[PDB]
Subunit: 249 residues, 4 copies
Amino acid sequence: SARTSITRREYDEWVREAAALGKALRYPITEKMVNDSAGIVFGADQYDAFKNGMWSGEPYEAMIIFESLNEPAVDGLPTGAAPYAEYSGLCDKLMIVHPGKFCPPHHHGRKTESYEVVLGEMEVFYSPTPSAESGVELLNFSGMPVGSPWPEGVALPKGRESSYEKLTSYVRLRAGDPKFVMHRKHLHAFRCPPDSDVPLVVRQVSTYSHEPTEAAAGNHAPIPSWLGMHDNDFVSDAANTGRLQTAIS
Amino acid sequence: SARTSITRREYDEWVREAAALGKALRYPITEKMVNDSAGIVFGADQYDAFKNGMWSGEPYEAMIIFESLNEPAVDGLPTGAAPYAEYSGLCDKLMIVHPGKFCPPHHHGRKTESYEVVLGEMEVFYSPTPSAESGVELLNFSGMPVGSPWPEGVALPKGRESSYEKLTSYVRLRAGDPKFVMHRKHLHAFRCPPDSDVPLVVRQVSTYSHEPTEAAAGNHAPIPSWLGMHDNDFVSDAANTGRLQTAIS
Amino acid sequence: SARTSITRREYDEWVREAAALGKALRYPITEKMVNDSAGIVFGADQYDAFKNGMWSGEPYEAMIIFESLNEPAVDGLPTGAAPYAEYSGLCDKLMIVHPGKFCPPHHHGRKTESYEVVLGEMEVFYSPTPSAESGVELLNFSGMPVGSPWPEGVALPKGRESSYEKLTSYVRLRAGDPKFVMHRKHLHAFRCPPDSDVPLVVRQVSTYSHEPTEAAAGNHAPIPSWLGMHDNDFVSDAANTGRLQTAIS
Amino acid sequence: SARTSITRREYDEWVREAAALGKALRYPITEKMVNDSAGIVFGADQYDAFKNGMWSGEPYEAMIIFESLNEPAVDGLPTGAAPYAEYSGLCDKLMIVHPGKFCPPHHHGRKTESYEVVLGEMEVFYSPTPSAESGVELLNFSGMPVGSPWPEGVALPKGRESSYEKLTSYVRLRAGDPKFVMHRKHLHAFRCPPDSDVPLVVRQVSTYSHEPTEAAAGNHAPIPSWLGMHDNDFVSDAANTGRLQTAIS
Ligand SMILES: O=C[C@@H](O)[C@@H](O)[C@@H](O)CO
Ligand SMILES: O=C[C@@H](O)[C@@H](O)[C@@H](O)CO
Ligand SMILES: O=C[C@@H](O)[C@@H](O)[C@@H](O)CO
Ligand SMILES: O=C[C@@H](O)[C@@H](O)[C@@H](O)CO
Ligand SMILES: OC[C@@H]1O[C@@H](O)[C@@H](O)[C@H]1O
Ligand SMILES: OC[C@@H]1O[C@@H](O)[C@@H](O)[C@H]1O
Ligand SMILES: OC[C@@H]1O[C@@H](O)[C@@H](O)[C@H]1O
Ligand SMILES: OC[C@@H]1O[C@@H](O)[C@@H](O)[C@H]1O
Ligand SMILES: OC[C@@H]1O[C@@H](O)[C@@H](O)[C@H]1O
Ligand SMILES: OC[C@@H]1O[C@@H](O)[C@@H](O)[C@H]1O
Ligand SMILES: OC[C@@H]1O[C@@H](O)[C@@H](O)[C@H]1O
Ligand SMILES: OC[C@@H]1O[C@@H](O)[C@@H](O)[C@H]1O
Ligand SMILES: OC[C@@H]1O[C@@H](O)[C@@H](O)[C@H]1O
Ligand SMILES: OC[C@@H]1O[C@@H](O)[C@@H](O)[C@H]1O
Ligand SMILES: OC[C@@H]1O[C@@H](O)[C@@H](O)[C@H]1O
Ligand SMILES: OC[C@@H]1O[C@@H](O)[C@@H](O)[C@H]1O
Ligand SMILES: O[C@@H]1[C@H](O)[C@@H](O)OC[C@@H]1O
Ligand SMILES: O[C@@H]1[C@H](O)[C@@H](O)OC[C@@H]1O
Ligand SMILES: O[C@@H]1[C@H](O)[C@@H](O)OC[C@@H]1O
Ligand SMILES: O[C@@H]1[C@H](O)[C@@H](O)OC[C@@H]1O
Ligand SMILES: [Co+2]
Ligand SMILES: [Co+2]
Ligand SMILES: [Co+2]
Ligand SMILES: [Co+2]
């Protein structure tokens, strides 16, 4: 019974409804943005999320992302900035997470994110300490706030509870709150509360998103080194594979 | 009769109504964001915009900006990126321009912008060619699109028509359009059409905004060189002065 | 293969997503409003709409209705108005119709409706002539506008094409248009265009809705005669039955 | 210093900004709806509201109303309903009240209202007992809820505090709450809290609005008796006069 993919109908209903919800909330979703890469399922064992559906409230790692911008911002940069340009750029995405579902534990070496809740409430789990890079000095300025301890009773995905162990800091964001920054190199994950009557909708503004995915397999590289560059490190190895392509049957 | 400032009542009605409009459109406006620096008047001779008011449709250079984010994004950066970090960072602002009014001709040496129209329509004027920097190689990737010629009959601010001479390329953006990128070092300006029944509301996502203004006079500098760093070059000298502080009587 | 009901999962995903879309558009949807009567399927042979789903674009008669108000407005009425009070009252509902789907041909003897498109576009089909009531004088004031002829290529539900024969007048309504009135005793139906990227969402403001349905089976009758009073006359007999209760398996 | 009218500029800025706010909130505001009758000032001594402006927070009786529908709903009615048709009909309006301002104490003999808060919060004051009509039996069904006592510290308009004496019941409505019904013949008034950061925006759905005002002076009467029929009874005589026409200088 363990699902190994998502049917074309399950996929379209999930993604097209999400796109409509996005438009209702005034996010600029174009036709190209609504594709077979928008709906993400993090790992083969997470396809079981569609056993009972996106409204079951069950804890699984899957989400939708509509990307309206992923600008390298390389034009006009002095040549000397070429080796550090990968830490910059501008990316705008709308993220939709259903009740109980999660964006899994991971960190980026180059990308810094910010969250703006548009609908529902966002429960963020993260590590206030950066993931030290092997022998290399890093800049510091504000660091990350310690936050609060996890509330009791958070249901985690079966077979991936341990991937959340280090994301000890917690914060619950709501529409209207100040923008929340997630510095690069910091472990983070988030979910929509299981009792939510609406999907969690969040506007993410971050630096460039290096992701040689399926729908991202067809773009000239602004800088040589950027080609094939990956910047997503999932704590769970099971969440790495299926992140770059959803199995639609 | 030439106004030299804006009365406290004229200012508050302009800025508080704009903040409410922003909230209606779901932009996360906090209390701190609604201040005496949000309403901008570009030059002493532009205060005459309040002679007949923000609904006269007359061409003047004045606008409102609510900044929800201006993150240096320096944390986690390798030390070697310190000299180029100023070209990165993340800034999120909501801009409100009334009928006939303009955000004046200017360019940034370090900041790259992107526009998302939320309400009304945006008429952008710009130069598809970058403002060459004295003896220094720059990176290139996509450059700027040539766009279209200006439509006929655009009323420019009296005494500043020449500042628009070089911004020969034109594009009209609407809600739902793809995000529009304005690369750093490119001259640009924009206005709300004079016949618009609503103020132009635009979400701007850009790299860090270096602006030692009035409300920005009180923040630790992430990197030494950033202190007192200016990154706004207005074509009109008249628009430089009053950009950093609105005279409220 | 002919579906005879809708599964609990198909129902909830359809109705809960619709409720979320409604909230995003600012319609006041309460918990009680999201129930097993909100999703309507007009006839046993229309359950096949869930063969390929609400995003197939296929022509079927099914829709969702969230009722926020159905006030008799009997309080304060002079006793003499008791026999005509049934033509008054106030009803506020949000209607959601998916691509290609229809609200089937029908007329009301007592209820007058009005439409306000919130999202998408509404294609209304109707008869500009009232359905004459057996021997009884009726008041007239504005009547209904003749409208336009049907555009070519409208796909109707298989086995119910004839029910649309008399609804010869056509009008396409969009968000922002003047409110459109549908006088009582006039045949009407409507659909969401099959090529729409979003479900059609319409705010309906009408006089009292007399409907002894499933979720409506439990309310004191303001006036004696109102008890068990029906006011929905479907052109297709097949659309009458399943209108009062959706078969959820 | 006692203002006796509102300047053309004060009026337009108030009304045009309100119309834009309405559009942002998705209310279908057409060009005709934005006129010189939309902004209402209840009495000559209330023009002082523009002494310090709509953002002063001072208690004054003035508001804006955009009417999208006022349908007699007479078509299709049996002739015998002619004498009671005036209690029916359908009216849809968007009401905008600024901080501290009020819609003054009044009751309608024929019109029953309902409120839906779209933005901000609405503080309603009313009498749970109907205004008995001289020798005439009236129907009853749900009556009005007793509500709660007034919170302490409500600032009333100077020179009109007594008009509120009988409106002893209180209820505070917010966006998302169930629709609130105000039965005909019941005294009612409401205000936007003085500390609100946004104007109060409310969708009103009611039966026909009989109002021989300024912008309403030019429509055929559906039924003979309706001609010149008035249905607004203000507790304060000072609020009656200027209700039908705003003095714009
Ligand atoms: O935190 C989430 C961000 O990394 C998103 O843009 C995706 O990469 C999550 O997989
Ligand atoms: O183009 C406009 C941007 O530069 C804004 O953030 C302001 O700096 C305009 O003065
Ligand atoms: O035209 C549609 C209205 O009658 C709705 O309230 C429902 O009764 C449609 O079945
Ligand atoms: O309660 C307010 C309603 O009566 C409105 O439509 C206006 O008539 C208020 O003057
Ligand atoms: O609307 C675009 C279509 O819908 C999405 O499911 C994409 O797969 C694309 O095929
Ligand atoms: O909410 C949709 C349905 O109800 C829930 O119980 C899930 O199991 C799913 O099948
Ligand atoms: O131990 C300090 C750092 O913070 C935690 O997130 C760990 O991953 C480690 O990299
Ligand atoms: O709501 C905040 C106040 O309104 C704005 O006018 C700011 O000046 C601040 O004083
Ligand atoms: O729109 C507001 C008023 O009308 C316009 O004519 C301007 O002059 C201003 O005074
Ligand atoms: O002449 C090429 C460049 O483009 C234009 O914008 C000028 O400012 C110049 O700097
Ligand atoms: O959220 C309320 C639940 O969802 C809807 O499916 C209703 O059936 C009700 O059971
Ligand atoms: O849009 C969802 C899927 O795609 C359409 O082709 C329908 O058949 C349905 O199965
Ligand atoms: O024939 C005139 C009327 O208009 C049409 O709608 C028919 O139903 C009939 O009742
Ligand atoms: O936009 C319509 C104009 O604005 C409002 O002030 C009305 O008076 C009308 O003249
Ligand atoms: O909010 C606008 C200004 O500030 C308030 O104090 C009022 O007096 C008005 O003049
Ligand atoms: O005294 C009962 C009624 O209720 C109150 O509102 C009074 O106006 C009176 O008409
Ligand atoms: O123990 C809780 C959770 O299971 C873990 O992953 O993070 C810390 C939290 O308190
Ligand atoms: O001449 C027009 C305008 O006055 C100038 O500033 O830019 C080019 C345009 O065609
Ligand atoms: O023939 C078309 C349609 O099939 C019918 O039901 O109504 C009139 C229209 O022109
Ligand atoms: O006394 C308060 C108010 O002044 C009066 O008008 O209504 C009752 C309330 O408690
Ligand atoms: Co991330
Ligand atoms: Co700029
Ligand atoms: Co109907
Ligand atoms: Co009233």
